[PDB]
Design a binder for these strands. Sequence first.
DNA 1: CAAGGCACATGACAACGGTGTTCAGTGCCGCGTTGCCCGATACCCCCTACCCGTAGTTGACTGGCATCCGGGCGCCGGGTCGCC
Length: 105
Amino acid sequence: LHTPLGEDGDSEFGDLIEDSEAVVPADAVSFTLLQEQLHSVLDTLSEREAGVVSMRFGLTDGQPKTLDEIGKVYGVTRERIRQIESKTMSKLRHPSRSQVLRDYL
DNA sequence: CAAGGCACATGACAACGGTGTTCAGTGCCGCGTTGCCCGATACCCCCTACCCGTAGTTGACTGGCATCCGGGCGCCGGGTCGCC
């Protein structure tokens, strides 16, 4: 990386290649706005529906939880949880609570 | 002419009429919370073409590789040699 870069002075091949680990502020703030808007639309729905979808898709922890995995803290059945998840997906699929999330993809 | 005797109706007397109520029970027929029964997918098993580490190869075969310049200036600073 300390090669002359073909230039006798003031240059180094080590100062011409961009990295990839660096966080792009644009993408980061877009993600933050996505998180806030999704949390807002999530609060718009019922608090119970909100909580169950959040725990299923893991919106507070990195790893999502399985259906029956939610039926221990909340004390519900593996098929009840599936049913409320299904009707949550049905409601969120409504064009009402989709537009604000369309551009986010 | 006054008193005593018989009709019809009359102050109460309950019990039917008929309807809408008090409990009360149990459903009737609309909305909800959890039983099925499976089906798939993560976790053990064996071996094997290849990757990676180590062991030898008995004519002899005994000192490399250098650098090499047109700064240029200028100073500091000390070391080495000279003076004596």
